[PDB]
């Protein structure tokens, strides 16, 4: 038993673009969706045939004891993250996996994709051991409204806030800073 | 984003040698238990601090579309298995991690340890689209008798069965050939 050499196989488009933009709970924004998007020449069609059967996946990607945690410094940088499956699209030599709510941030690479088994993988009773309102500044109602032509619910998309003081916090193409009122959107 | 080179930090030992001899429901199985043990320099104490607060782990080892499957055959073999976590021993720079049922093949090479966790990890509602009688011959009770000195529950062990007509198993060191009959246990 020696080594491994890992090649991506996708690679996975999401609004959050740093670590810090994603919420401790993914599965209540419903709007921090993502594509994957299988890399040549694993973006064949045969490739994912009957993967729209299963409803969840499970995505391998790139990043107290280590293994005691979820931490990303690991002597194997491989993360799993199970996401809602929406829609397997097929376009022209183009596969996109559109999911649910995802927490990877943009751009993270894919290492396989699996069909998440509620059998093998569910187990509920494994054991261990602040709601807030959002408010816009007159300036930031503007510059959301503007926004919500390109990417709509943007407004609602922000729940994510939901979880002096002039914090930042970079969500798409947007640098949102700001019960909280948020600021400026640009 | 390129390429990853992976070090296997572990090794798992376990009563099935071959994929055969895996039942496909491993949970019923209470003998087909499992210790990962931990290869340098990543079975250091520290590693594994606090470890034994989790009650389930998830071992990421090495094995329609193949997406679509958990084939082994993938353009990365890279496998999941949650298992139960019964004890986490040290002893004279060894770890051993003593698992519960699990359902890889013995000296399986182990990629990464995480903790299983109910809230991100467990999704039940996840869709997607024959008890048998065990019997041993005289020569097969005297056989399994003269093992159960050396491994205890050999014979209660064999629930594996219970999932002309001479096929073979191996189990442990041992080749059980045989409602079903089970012939010599050798």
């Not at 293994?67 to 183009?94: D, W, Y």
């Not at 959301?144 to 390109?150: A, G, H, M, S, T």
């Not at 709509?152 to 939901?162: G, K, N, T």
Request: include cysteine.
């Amino acid at each position: 038993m020696n080594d491994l050499t890992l090649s991506p196989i996708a690679i996975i488009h999401t609004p959050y673009k740093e670590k810090f933009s994603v919420p401790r709970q993914p599965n209540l924004v419903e709007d921090g969706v993502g594509i994957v998007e299988l890399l040549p020449p694993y973006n064949s069609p045969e490739a994912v045939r009957g993967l729209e059967q299963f409803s969840h996946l499970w995505l391998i990607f790139q990043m107290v004891g280590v293994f005691a945690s979820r931490a990303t410094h690991r002597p194997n940088p491989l993360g799993m993250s199970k996401v809602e499956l929406r829609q397997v699209e097929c376009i022209n030599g183009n596969i996109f996996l559109h999911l649910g709510a995802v927490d990877l941030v943009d751009g993270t690479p894919i290492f396989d994709i699996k069909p998440y088994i509620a059998y093998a993988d569910s187990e509920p009773n494994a054991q261990s051991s602040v709601k807030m309102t959002v408010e816009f500044t007159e300036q930031a109602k503007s510059a959301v409204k503007k926004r919500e032509e390109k990417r709509p619910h943007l407004s609602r998309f922000i729940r994510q806030v939901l979880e002096d003081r002039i914090y930042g916090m970079s969500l798409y193409e947007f640098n949102v800073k700001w019960a909280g009122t948020v600021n400026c959107v640009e």
